[PDB]
Design an enzyme around this catalytic site. Structure first.
Site, PDB file in Angstrom:
ATOM      1  N   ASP A  85      -6.351   6.241  -4.468  1.00  7.51           N
ATOM      2  CA  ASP A  85      -6.153   4.713  -4.572  1.00  7.51           C
ATOM      3  C   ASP A  85      -6.245   4.675  -6.458  1.00  7.51           C
ATOM      4  O   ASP A  85      -6.980   4.947  -7.581  1.00  7.51           O
ATOM      5  CB  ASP A  85      -7.063   3.756  -3.952  1.00  7.51           C
ATOM      6  CG  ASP A  85      -8.239   3.385  -4.245  1.00  7.51           C
ATOM      7  OD1 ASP A  85      -9.191   2.522  -3.660  1.00  7.51           O
ATOM      8  OD2 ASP A  85      -8.312   3.569  -5.341  1.00  7.51           O
ATOM      9  N   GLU A 118       0.960  -1.039  -0.030  1.00  2.78           N
ATOM     10  CA  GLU A 118       0.379  -0.153   0.160  1.00  2.78           C
ATOM     11  C   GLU A 118       0.513   1.380  -0.179  1.00  2.78           C
ATOM     12  O   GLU A 118       0.361   1.761   0.297  1.00  2.78           O
ATOM     13  CB  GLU A 118      -1.445  -0.186   1.597  1.00  2.78           C
ATOM     14  CG  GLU A 118      -1.701  -0.764   1.162  1.00  2.78           C
ATOM     15  CD  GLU A 118      -2.998  -1.122   0.042  1.00  2.78           C
ATOM     16  OE1 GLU A 118      -3.593  -2.180   0.560  1.00  2.78           O
ATOM     17  OE2 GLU A 118      -3.047  -0.121  -0.371  1.00  2.78           O
TER      18      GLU A 118
HETATM   19  K   LIG Z   1      -1.993   2.999  -1.908  1.00  7.06           K
END
Ligand SMILES: [K+]
Ligand SMILES: [Cl-]
Ligand SMILES: [Cl-]
Length: 164
Positions: free
Chosen positions: A20, A11
């Site tokens: 995202d 992430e």
């Molecule tokens: K991410």
């Protein structure tokens, strides 16, 4: 290697609101704020999450704080999900981490479509499960990450993350 280090790799860490891979407002270490296209809405979610009026930026510590909560909640939810708990329980610790990682990314709702893959994992049919997992929107949209996760389910080793 452990679930926190693994997801940190997957992430990244960003202290300002960003979007995202799905175009959704997120912050910190993969902390999804909302699926709404409204930035103000996102900022409100952030303030609620942190407990203060932030103006879209947080500290590293704050980021870590949400992350810890997020990891915990992911596990907790898996434990509460009758469709996932059994799989989770049947696995070794390395593979369990890979399953938590998936849920953190796609949610329990996203995991609903993996019934067949999960079954192969439960049967300990590693290569079969690996092939199956790849036949998904998930794999197609985030192939590099999915490939890593799949190698962990296939091998029970951290080799895919070992050099990252
Ligand atoms: K991410
Ligand atoms: Cl939260
Ligand atoms: Cl990817």
């Amino acid at each position: 290697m452990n679930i926190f280090e693994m997801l940190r790799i997957d992430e990244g860490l960003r202290l300002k609101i960003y979007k995202d891979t799905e175009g959704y407002y997120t912050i910190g270490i993969g902390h999804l704020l909302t699926k709404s296209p409204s930035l103000n809405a996102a900022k409100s979610e952030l303030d609620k999450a942190i407990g203060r009026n932030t103006n879209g930026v947080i500290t590293k510590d704050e980021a870590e704080k949400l992350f810890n909560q997020d990891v915990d909640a992911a596990v907790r939810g898996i434990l509460r999900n009758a469709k996932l708990k059994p799989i989770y329980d049947s696995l070794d610790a390395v593979r369990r981490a890979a399953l938590v990682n998936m849920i953190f990314q796609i949610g329990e709702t996203g995991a609903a479509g993996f019934t067949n893959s999960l079954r192969y994992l439960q049967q300990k049919r590693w290569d079969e499960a690996a092939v199956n997992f790849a036949k998904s929107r998930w794999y197609n949209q985030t192939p590099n990450r999915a490939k890593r996760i799949i190698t962990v389910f296939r091998t029970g080793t951290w080799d895919a993350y070992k050099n990252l």
